[PDB]
Design a protein around this ligand. Structure first.
Ligand SMILES: [Zn+2]
Lengths: 136, 178, 68, 287, 32
């Protein structure tokens, strides 16, 4: 999946320009995660962020979920990837990062029994209420 | 799936994906139903040997261009002058003026045909492919085994996934591990 | 609605053993739970051309009143 | 924490108190209170409706009587059920539904008191045939005034229940409040006892309307059906190749070919069968 | 060969009885 990376960037840009002020931002960050699924290629989370920081209150839950979709099947490196974008070190005030972060670990390591079951077990012991126990 | 059975992730992944009315972030679950369209020629436990095998397509070639990213640069540039009048015989006698000026002083320009038609017909449908080779699932039956190489397959190869090659007689080679 | 898909997904391809549960969920007057039985009869009968399924599923496809 | 696509539950008695109090004072914009319960974040339900006495000011905050407020609540605590008020309503007869000038002033008092306090506007005189013109609305703030109001999110049940109508969006929609979704809490132990008890007649099914009114009807219909058969003969014996699908469209008359046909014959069939089956069963049963 | 043809004719016969039953309901429904 990494040695056959012919995706197209300009189609995603020729749909980017027609994005008006609707809630299509979630519809675009689910679109790129589909056509970069398992690719482990982060360029939209690199080349622009101010358009990504426009939508809120569930799109942050969707965007950090889409980070796990691009890294599907990423066994050891996905742990240290979100041991960089931790549930408590990005920002302690936003529960949508730590909610969709734990949801992203489940998206990566589906059908893989290991410590990540126990790692998510211990963080459902100590968690907040609403949009932490969802993605957990 | 491959052998007549059905996948448990591809069913569960698509049915919760039907529930995108009531919750948009359930749409991440469709990534479970993404199964590869590739074959894998792993012969030993570690070696994937670099093998060459070919196609049997009926006339033609296909398969994964995605090329077109032009903005269609267009020009209005003109409106055709449609004055149909004494103009018609006036341009005709002007073309008579060129039959004294062109063909009597210097015009010897020429061009050649059928160079661009020549490269099309001897084409492949014998495309060679290394170990993790993609193939459209419609062409799991019109592929061709690598009989022209030394290293020829052993498992019945008719559907995509993973196989063993029979790495044949001695001097085993051709590692790739990126 | 979370338990709607959940009790549909606890059984998978039993192909005869869900029939008491299939009859129980659809006879109830809860519209979500009737909808939940329709996902349950889908997942218990995956890929099989069951005549009893295609009769019963099309029957409630005609006569039922809730759109969902 | 901000709004989503909500849902409004109304009880069966609540809608009946709306249309009855609206039909009572049909000219003069009746007013009342709405009593329910806040079950979660973003679904509201209502169980009860009681009205207000008529004020000379009109539909405003001055029409709210606080001594009629608390003493009516004093009685409903000890009898039935005590619960919190969740909103209010009025009736706007001259149009369908939109919050007017003095509508929106008393809304600001209620959302300062309650969390949401959803308004309800009902035209009583427009609802005639089989449908009701009811809709519930809810005011927005000024903090997102250069931003997109109604901050709605991951759902797909927003495009239904109404598109914004042009007689309603010419006023404060959509940059002043938002529209909300309303379905009905349809229940059993009420539905069948309203159905079977409102439309019912026991001995009517085997009456006779007997024969002197009925043989005259069988006398009449056959006579023009004879001429209808003569007109049916005329098109059949015509049968010309004048491009007969174009010959039929230039001979449209709201008439014979099959429409003015057996439709009468079906009525002649059903009338005599129900007449004769009732006649034969009554000879059987009685002695 | 022949046993598979006999099973498929059993299946297809019981199939289009069900789709016959659907059109019986809809034509009854569109009258109302
Ligand atoms: Zn009003």
């Amino acid at each position: 999946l990494i040695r056959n990376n012919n995706t197209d960037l300009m189609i995603l840009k020729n749909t980017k320009d027609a994005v008006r002020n609707s809630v299509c931002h979630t519809a675009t960050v689910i679109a790129n995660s589909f056509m970069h699924c398992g690719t482990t290629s982060d360029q939209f989370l690199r080349d622009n962020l101010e358009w990504l920081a426009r939508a809120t209150n569930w799109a942050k839950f969707t965007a950090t979920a889409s980070l796990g979709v691009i890294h599907k099947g990423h066994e050891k490196e996905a742990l240290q990837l979100m041991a960089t974008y931790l549930p408590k070190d990005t920002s302690p005030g936003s529960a949508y990062q730590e909610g969709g972060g734990l949801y992203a670990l489940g998206l990566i390591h589906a059908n893989h029994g290991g410590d990540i079951i126990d790692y998510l077990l211990n963080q459902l012991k100590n968690a907040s209420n609403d949009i932490v126990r969802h993605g957990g | 799936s491959r052998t007549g059975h059905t996948h448990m992730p591809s069913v569960v992944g698509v049915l919760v994906f039907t529930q995108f009315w009531f919750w948009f972030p359930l749409s991440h679950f469709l990534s479970l139903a993404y199964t590869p369209t590739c074959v894998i020629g792993l012969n030993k436990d570690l070696k994937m040997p670099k093998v060459q095998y070919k196609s049997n397509c009926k006339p033609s070639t296909f398969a994964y261009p995605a090329p077109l990213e032009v903005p269609k640069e267009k020009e209005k540039e003109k409106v055709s002058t449609a004055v149909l009048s004494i103009t018609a015989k006036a341009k005709k006698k002007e073309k008579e003026k060129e039959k004294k000026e062109e063909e009597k002083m210097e015009v010897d320009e020429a061009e050649k045909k059928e160079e661009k038609e020549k490269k099309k017909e001897p084409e492949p449908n014998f495309q060679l492919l290394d170990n993790p080779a993609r193939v459209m699932p419609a062409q799991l039956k019109v592929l061709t085994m690598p009989e022209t190489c030394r290293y020829q397959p052993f498992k019945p190869l008719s559907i995509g996934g993973i196989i063993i090659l029979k790495d044949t007689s001695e001097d085993i080679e051709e590692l790739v591990e990126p | 609605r979370g338990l709607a898909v959940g009790i549909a997904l606890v059984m998978y391809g039993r192909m005869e053993e869900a029939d008491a549960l299939i009859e129980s969920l659809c006879r109830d007057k809860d519209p979500i739970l009737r909808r939940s039985g329709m996902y349950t009869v889908a997942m218990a009968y995956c890929g099989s051309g069951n005549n009893k399924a295609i009769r019963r599923l099309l029957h409630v496809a005609v006569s039922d009143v809730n759109d969902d | 924490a901000v709004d989503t696509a909500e849902q409004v539950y109304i009880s069966s008695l609540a809608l009946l108190k709306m249309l009855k109090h609206g039909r009572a004072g049909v000219p003069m914009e009746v007013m009342g209170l709405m009593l329910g319960e806040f079950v979660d974040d973003y679904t509201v339900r209502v169980i009860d409706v009681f009205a207000m006495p008529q004020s000379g000011t009109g539909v405003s905050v001055e029409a709210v009587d606080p001594v009629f407020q608390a003493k009516m609540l004093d009685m409903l605590k000890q009898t039935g059920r005590p619960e919190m008020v969740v909103g209010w309503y009025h009736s706007h007869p001259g149009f369908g539904c939109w919050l007017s000038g003095v509508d929106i002033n008393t809304q600001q008092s209620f959302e300062a008191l309650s969390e949401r306090a959803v308004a309800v506007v009902v035209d009583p005189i427009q609802s005639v045939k089989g449908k009701v013109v009811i809709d519930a609305f809810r005011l927005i703030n000024a903090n997102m005034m250069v931003l997109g109001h109604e901050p709605r999110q991951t759902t797909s049940n927003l495009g239904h229940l109404n598109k914004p109508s042009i007689q309603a969006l010419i006023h404060g929609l959509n940059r002043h409040y938002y529209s909300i979704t309303i379905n009905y809490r349809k229940n059993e132990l009420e539905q069948k006892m309203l159905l079977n008890l409102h439309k019912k007649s026991w001995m009517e099914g085997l009456t006779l309307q007997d024969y002197s009114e009925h043989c005259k009807h069988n006398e009449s219909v056959v006579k023009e059906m004879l001429e209808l058969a003569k007109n049916y003969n005329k098109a059949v014996e015509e049968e010309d190749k004048m491009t007969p699908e174009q010959l039929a469209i230039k001979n449209v008359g709201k008439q014979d070919p099959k429409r003015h046909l057996e439709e009468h014959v079906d009525v002649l069939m059903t009338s005599n069968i129900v007449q004769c089956l009732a006649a034969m069963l009554d000879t059987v049963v009685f002695k | 060969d022949l046993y598979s043809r006999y099973k498929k004719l059993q299946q297809e016969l019981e199939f289009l009885e069900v789709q016959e039953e659907y059109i019986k309901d809809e034509q009854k429904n569109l009258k109302k």
